[PDB]
């Protein structure tokens, strides 16, 4: 729901009196009324526009007195009556154009990715290689594949490397799935700062108990920035399988060659490895080492502020009048929403050391037909 | 998000409707309660996963229970009546077939079969 | 339940009214929060059931709590003012009697008697 | 300078027009990139000046590179196609005749000459 | 920022306008460049903090630098010209007074002063 709220604070107040016949004929009051009003939206989880209009004052009260026959007038600690209007506005500034499009164009995180190795095609086939090799060697002893400089130790080294790769890909998948949450990836850009100054002259500060004129100077500042959140498109995420079987497999491998010679090898988690290797292989080949993404809405925030400072001009005032310096500040803030044409980006998944783990696994030197 | 109230119709579609009220909500768990003169009604709903066995495809398990406590009267101590159901299937299975299984179980259970079961007849 | 909003009227009937709303719920406990320039308000509601022992009657306890904290100003440090009431009764007893006892407690306590208790006389 | 995008018309005049995006910038270096379903386009600009020597000539080298790579398909791995040009001259040289030499080199290269060159015709 | 081009009018407001072009930006550090047949124009802007001292006030620094190089001609070797300003004041102090300082200095300097100043006068 959209609500409009108004709120105010008292800045200063004072008293001014005129005596005649020894009587206070007029003793009128003066108030400074700090004012601000805001608009905001609540009850909707989605980001909403909002804006603020806000103003304050800072006044050094007048002082002094003058005497006449049976009558006087005095403005001690009396803030100037000029503040009763307090109407102020920001200075004109150059207009911005097409901020949303530029932000969307510059913010795109698509960038090239690491090249996919050739063995990723065979990635799905690793488990039966190892199973059949171990089974044949156990059936016919270790003498097998001595012609190829192969044995128990190379096999265990290769399977350990595969488990390392599996855990690394698992952790990376966990990280991607965490990223899908909490609104996706956020980025920020800056859209410049505009500063302008001017001068003003002959500002009447008081119209009773004499007259007061003061100089005027104005300062204006504007900022502008934009933010967007890039989130992976649903369904493009990698497999997110949890993994405690690898701990068990590593525990078995610690038994050494002697353990695997015993009934230990029949405890390998072949089915899990086959399923997950096939899933990851088909996913990697489906994509190209990348996750897709789409942009959410684009927002722009533009704060604007100005200062209005005065200095009392003493050449057009009654001699008894002293002081009267004052300053004012006006601030505004805004939040607004925009959207652009559909865009899709690609972000690398794994790079270098991630994919290089098993690029030279030793079992590849045996002909396939013996295994196949 | 079943609603702030749950309706229990004892004796099937016959009647005797009781209305339970929400009490506690935490960790994908809910439970409702209603006191009466001589008995109390309560329900519970839970969700969880199993402990993975290193050669095992993940499952999810769903259960809901009804409990009936009767306060002690005379020389007879208090006791309780309950009846609950649970469902189990892999993570990421097709929901249509899993749901389809279960309505068969509901259809099988009725007055006559409950009468047989209470008779220790297997 | 108890509604999303809780209203407290300082000064009793015809007094100053403040409004509270839900922030979190857990373990049969819910509590609310309100901010104010020189103070703040806290509202809490809790329920509990005493542990089961072999041979004696089991009890269950309900508690509600109001408290306001006045932010420290100058020399004066932080301090609070709170008041809470609890009801304890057995699991199976009739509700009307407990309600009547609570109503008696509520009716007995009034402004003048609050002042007299601040008077320290027993 | 260099705009937010770098336009490239592969195939010479009249070809398909692509528009790379500004993606990185540092130390007089900037680079443009664009992703595509079967391939990608890469364009970077670099500048460099050699260090000062006691008695030698101070030279400056520009570099511009286009790079094109196609993703793997089946058993065929990935491969990349690129071509870059450099210009070298002293710090205070006359710019216009350097531009004339650049025009000469650009004009000499044409599709026919590229065809002759790739055939290892020396 | 302030833009990508800066105008240098040699001889004050007399004329001879020169337009440098932005070449780089690294961490609040900017410099523009422009080559000419017999000269090169370059400008630099920098902002920075002093080393933090446990019990001394922090200071702002602004630097604006102009330089010029004349290419070797005949037997005359390379040589340079430059003129730069520095402003120092504490962090958070009033900006307008600091502006008035510095611009007072800028008003003080004029052609006659440089004519005298270059004559080693003091
Ligand atoms: Ca029945
Ligand atoms: Ca059905």
PDB file of C-alpha atoms and ligand atoms in Angstrom, chain B residues 96 99-100 103, ligand 2:
ATOM      1  CA  UNK B  96       1.971 -37.708 -10.021  1.00  0.00           C
ATOM      2  CA  UNK B  99       0.541 -39.262  -5.128  1.00  0.00           C
ATOM      3  CA  UNK B 100      -1.360 -41.899  -7.116  1.00  0.00           C
ATOM      4  CA  UNK B 103      -5.165 -42.962  -2.602  1.00  0.00           C
TER       5      UNK B 103
HETATM    6 CA1  LIG F   2      -4.898 -39.361  -9.324  1.00  0.00          CA
END
